[PDB]
Amino acid sequence: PHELESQFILRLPPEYASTVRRAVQSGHVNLKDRLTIELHPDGRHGIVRVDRVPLASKLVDLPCVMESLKTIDKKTFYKTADICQMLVSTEKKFIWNHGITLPLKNVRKRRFRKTAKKDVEKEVKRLLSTDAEAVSTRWEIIAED
Amino acid sequence: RFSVAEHQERYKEECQRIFDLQNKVLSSTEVLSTVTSLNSSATGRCLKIYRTFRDEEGKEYVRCETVRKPAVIDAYVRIRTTKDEEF
């Protein structure tokens, strides 16, 4: 079978980003030893090790949706993957408010209509599971108390 | 007044203005600088769930649990009302 590839964005500190950029544009396999990525079983925490120097990482959710688009002739572009996550290196904490481009900043706060995002229903499932541990329940619409 | 040319032209100009407004905001390379609150439902209340289970050996403890999340409320009640009609 085929499994859709999972692309994400890695953001590094600027000096470490310059060293990683120079090693990527060089193209040797020396970069492979220099740059490693360890993702912790939390799922939202990691280490990125640049030149064997550990950096602390968080996998965050991006407010917009990006899409990688490949081309062969630079006139027709084929969508390859959807990007929604970023492993910035240096819950509410795992949500990024700003977008990657310069015009998109505080997008979540200002350029997003506040219909809703998501949590409430997982709690409902847990509540129904607990409810089935009952024979008599008492409920009262309440006031200030 | 009418709506033959007036309505059509009004719609057209609002369209050019919004198109112009979106192009500018989106192509901006300017750096940017880093709502009505609903009541606990229209009825302004919460949901409470007193209960009853049997512990190991012999016991009959009762748990009263209060849900103050109006989102959990809506989804919870909707199943009962459905299961009440599901008989």
Short mmCIF file of C-alpha atoms in Angstrom, two decimals:
data_model
loop_
_atom_site.label_atom_id
_atom_site.label_comp_id
_atom_site.label_asym_id
_atom_site.label_seq_id
_atom_site.Cartn_x
_atom_site.Cartn_y
_atom_site.Cartn_z
CA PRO A 1 0.00 0.00 0.00
CA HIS A 2 0.97 3.72 -0.02
CA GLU A 3 1.13 5.86 3.16
CA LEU A 4 0.80 9.66 2.75
CA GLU A 5 4.15 11.28 3.69
CA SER A 6 4.12 13.43 6.82
CA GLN A 7 5.95 16.72 6.36
CA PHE A 8 6.43 19.27 9.13
CA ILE A 9 8.48 22.45 9.54
CA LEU A 10 11.57 22.61 11.77
CA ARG A 11 12.41 26.01 13.27
CA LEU A 12 15.89 26.39 14.76
CA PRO A 13 17.72 29.15 16.61
CA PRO A 14 19.28 31.54 14.08
CA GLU A 15 22.96 30.60 14.48
CA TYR A 16 22.07 26.90 14.51
CA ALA A 17 19.77 27.55 11.55
CA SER A 18 22.70 29.06 9.66
CA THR A 19 24.92 26.04 10.38
CA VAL A 20 22.16 23.60 9.38
CA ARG A 21 21.46 25.64 6.21
CA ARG A 22 25.14 25.63 5.21
CA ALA A 23 25.35 21.88 5.82
CA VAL A 24 22.15 21.22 3.82
CA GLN A 25 23.26 23.32 0.84
CA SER A 26 26.66 21.61 0.95
CA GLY A 27 25.01 18.23 0.44
CA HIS A 28 27.43 15.71 2.03
CA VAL A 29 26.24 12.90 4.39
CA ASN A 30 28.34 14.69 7.07
CA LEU A 31 25.09 16.60 7.84
CA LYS A 32 23.35 13.26 8.58
CA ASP A 33 25.67 12.61 11.59
CA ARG A 34 25.49 16.31 12.67
CA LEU A 35 21.69 16.70 12.71
CA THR A 36 19.51 14.29 14.71
CA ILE A 37 15.91 14.47 16.00
CA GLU A 38 14.63 12.63 19.10
CA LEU A 39 10.85 12.83 19.68
CA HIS A 40 9.74 12.05 23.23
CA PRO A 41 6.76 9.78 24.06
CA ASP A 42 4.82 12.87 25.17
CA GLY A 43 4.41 13.53 21.46
CA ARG A 44 4.84 17.29 21.90
CA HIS A 45 8.44 17.41 23.17
CA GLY A 46 11.79 16.67 21.64
CA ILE A 47 15.48 17.29 21.26
CA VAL A 48 17.00 18.48 18.03
CA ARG A 49 20.77 17.91 18.21
CA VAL A 50 22.76 20.25 15.89
CA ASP A 51 26.48 19.27 15.79
CA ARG A 52 25.78 17.06 18.88
CA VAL A 53 24.51 20.15 20.80
CA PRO A 54 21.05 19.39 22.36
CA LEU A 55 18.21 21.95 21.82
CA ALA A 56 14.77 21.74 23.47
CA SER A 57 11.86 21.28 21.12
CA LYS A 58 8.10 21.51 21.11
CA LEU A 59 5.81 20.24 18.36
CA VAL A 60 3.15 22.93 17.97
CA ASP A 61 -0.02 23.25 15.89
CA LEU A 62 -0.08 25.94 13.28
CA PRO A 63 -3.15 28.18 12.89
CA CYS A 64 -3.34 28.08 9.09
CA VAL A 65 -2.96 25.08 6.80
CA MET A 66 0.03 24.89 4.49
CA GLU A 67 0.39 22.60 1.49
CA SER A 68 3.60 21.51 -0.24
CA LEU A 69 3.33 21.86 -4.01
CA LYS A 70 5.89 20.29 -6.32
CA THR A 71 6.47 21.13 -9.95
CA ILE A 72 8.50 20.05 -12.95
CA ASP A 73 7.89 22.99 -15.32
CA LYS A 74 7.00 25.80 -12.82
CA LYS A 75 3.59 26.23 -14.47
CA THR A 76 1.53 23.33 -13.07
CA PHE A 77 1.88 22.47 -9.38
CA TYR A 78 0.87 19.20 -7.74
CA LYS A 79 -0.06 19.06 -4.07
CA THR A 80 2.16 16.63 -2.19
CA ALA A 81 1.24 17.00 1.50
CA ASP A 82 -0.51 19.10 4.13
CA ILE A 83 1.63 20.80 6.79
CA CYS A 84 0.07 21.76 10.10
CA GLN A 85 2.86 21.23 12.64
CA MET A 86 6.14 22.83 13.53
CA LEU A 87 9.00 21.55 15.74
CA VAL A 88 10.17 24.93 17.18
CA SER A 89 13.52 24.52 19.00
CA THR A 90 15.46 26.76 21.45
CA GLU A 91 -2.73 21.87 25.11
CA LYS A 92 -2.74 25.72 24.97
CA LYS A 93 1.11 25.73 25.00
CA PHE A 94 1.21 23.38 21.95
CA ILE A 95 -0.93 25.80 19.87
CA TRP A 96 1.01 28.46 17.85
CA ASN A 97 -0.89 31.75 17.41
CA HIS A 98 1.18 33.22 14.57
CA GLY A 99 1.55 32.03 11.00
CA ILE A 100 4.83 31.39 9.19
CA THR A 101 4.68 34.30 6.75
CA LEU A 102 5.17 37.92 7.77
CA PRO A 103 1.59 39.14 6.96
CA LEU A 104 0.14 36.36 9.09
CA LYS A 105 0.96 37.20 12.72
CA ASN A 106 -1.55 36.84 15.64
CA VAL A 107 -3.73 35.37 12.81
CA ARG A 108 -5.53 33.18 15.37
CA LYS A 109 -6.38 36.24 17.53
CA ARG A 110 -7.16 38.82 14.76
CA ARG A 111 -7.59 37.33 11.24
CA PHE A 112 -9.59 34.27 12.40
CA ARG A 113 -13.41 34.36 12.76
CA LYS A 114 -14.21 32.98 16.25
CA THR A 115 -16.78 30.26 15.37
CA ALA A 116 -14.85 27.65 17.54
CA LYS A 117 -11.94 25.14 17.28
CA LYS A 118 -12.62 22.08 19.54
CA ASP A 119 -12.08 18.31 24.38
CA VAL A 120 -15.76 19.08 25.18
CA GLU A 121 -17.00 15.83 23.50
CA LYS A 122 -14.23 13.55 24.91
CA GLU A 123 -15.36 14.85 28.32
CA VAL A 124 -18.99 13.98 27.27
CA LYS A 125 -17.91 10.40 26.40
CA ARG A 126 -16.18 10.09 29.82
CA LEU A 127 -19.34 11.48 31.52
CA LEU A 128 -21.63 8.93 29.71
CA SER A 129 -19.24 6.13 30.74
CA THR A 130 -19.45 7.28 34.41
CA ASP A 131 -23.29 7.68 34.07
CA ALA A 132 -23.52 4.05 33.33
CA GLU A 133 -22.25 3.49 36.92
CA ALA A 134 -25.63 4.70 38.29
CA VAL A 135 -29.13 3.61 39.45
CA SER A 136 -30.34 7.10 40.61
CA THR A 137 -29.03 10.58 39.56
CA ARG A 138 -30.02 14.00 40.94
CA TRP A 139 -29.72 17.15 38.75
CA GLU A 140 -30.80 20.76 39.47
CA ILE A 141 -30.60 23.90 37.29
CA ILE A 142 -28.72 26.14 39.80
CA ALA A 143 -28.00 29.79 40.74
CA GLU A 144 -25.24 31.64 42.62
CA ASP A 145 -23.97 29.40 45.44
CA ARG B 1 -35.01 54.53 -5.62
CA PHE B 2 -34.71 51.22 -7.57
CA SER B 3 -32.59 48.01 -7.68
CA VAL B 4 -31.87 47.50 -11.42
CA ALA B 5 -28.59 49.49 -11.65
CA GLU B 6 -28.38 50.64 -8.01
CA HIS B 7 -28.26 47.09 -6.54
CA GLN B 8 -25.99 45.79 -9.29
CA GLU B 9 -23.44 48.68 -9.01
CA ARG B 10 -23.49 48.59 -5.22
CA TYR B 11 -22.67 44.86 -5.27
CA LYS B 12 -19.94 45.44 -7.87
CA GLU B 13 -18.21 48.21 -5.92
CA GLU B 14 -18.34 46.27 -2.66
CA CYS B 15 -16.74 43.38 -4.57
CA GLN B 16 -13.88 45.57 -5.88
CA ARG B 17 -13.33 47.08 -2.48
CA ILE B 18 -13.08 43.67 -0.72
CA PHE B 19 -10.84 42.31 -3.48
CA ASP B 20 -8.58 45.34 -3.10
CA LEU B 21 -8.59 45.07 0.70
CA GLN B 22 -7.62 41.37 0.72
CA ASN B 23 -4.84 41.80 -1.84
CA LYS B 24 -3.20 44.50 0.23
CA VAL B 25 -3.45 42.78 3.62
CA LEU B 26 -2.20 39.45 2.28
CA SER B 27 0.78 40.83 0.34
CA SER B 28 1.84 43.00 3.35
CA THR B 29 5.44 42.20 4.43
CA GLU B 30 4.84 44.46 7.49
CA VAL B 31 5.62 42.64 10.79
CA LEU B 32 2.54 42.39 13.07
CA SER B 33 2.58 42.85 16.89
CA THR B 34 1.96 39.76 19.11
CA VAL B 35 -15.52 38.46 21.79
CA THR B 36 -19.03 38.26 23.35
CA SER B 37 -18.91 35.79 26.29
CA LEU B 38 -21.88 33.35 26.28
CA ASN B 39 -23.61 32.51 29.62
CA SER B 40 -23.64 28.88 30.90
CA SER B 41 -26.38 28.31 28.21
CA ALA B 42 -29.57 30.34 27.56
CA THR B 43 -31.03 29.03 30.82
CA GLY B 44 -27.81 29.98 32.68
CA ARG B 45 -27.49 26.76 34.74
CA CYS B 46 -25.41 23.55 35.14
CA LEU B 47 -25.99 19.74 34.96
CA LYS B 48 -25.59 17.48 38.07
CA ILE B 49 -25.35 13.71 38.16
CA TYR B 50 -25.84 12.04 41.67
CA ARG B 51 -25.49 8.21 41.16
CA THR B 52 -25.14 4.70 42.80
CA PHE B 53 -22.62 1.78 42.38
CA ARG B 54 -21.64 -1.39 44.35
CA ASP B 55 -18.07 -1.56 45.80
CA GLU B 56 -16.05 -4.83 46.29
CA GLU B 57 -17.38 -7.07 49.13
CA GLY B 58 -20.63 -5.26 50.07
CA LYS B 59 -21.20 -1.48 49.72
CA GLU B 60 -23.67 0.95 48.01
CA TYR B 61 -21.84 4.31 47.59
CA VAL B 62 -23.58 7.13 45.60
CA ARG B 63 -21.57 9.70 43.55
CA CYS B 64 -23.00 13.18 42.83
CA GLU B 65 -21.05 14.79 39.93
CA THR B 66 -21.75 18.35 38.66
CA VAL B 67 -20.95 19.31 35.00
CA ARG B 68 -20.44 23.12 34.64
CA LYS B 69 -19.30 22.82 30.99
CA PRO B 70 -22.32 23.79 28.83
CA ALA B 71 -20.73 21.93 25.91
CA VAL B 72 -20.58 18.64 27.83
CA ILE B 73 -24.15 19.36 28.97
CA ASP B 74 -25.59 19.63 25.44
CA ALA B 75 -23.99 16.42 24.18
CA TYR B 76 -24.88 14.50 27.34
CA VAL B 77 -28.58 15.47 27.44
CA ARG B 78 -29.04 14.95 23.66
CA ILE B 79 -28.20 11.23 24.05
CA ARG B 80 -30.65 10.72 26.97
CA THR B 81 -33.46 12.55 25.06
CA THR B 82 -32.59 10.29 22.12
CA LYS B 83 -32.34 7.13 24.24
CA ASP B 84 -35.60 8.18 25.92
CA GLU B 85 -37.21 8.14 22.46
CA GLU B 86 -35.13 5.13 21.39
CA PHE B 87 -37.36 2.80 23.50
#
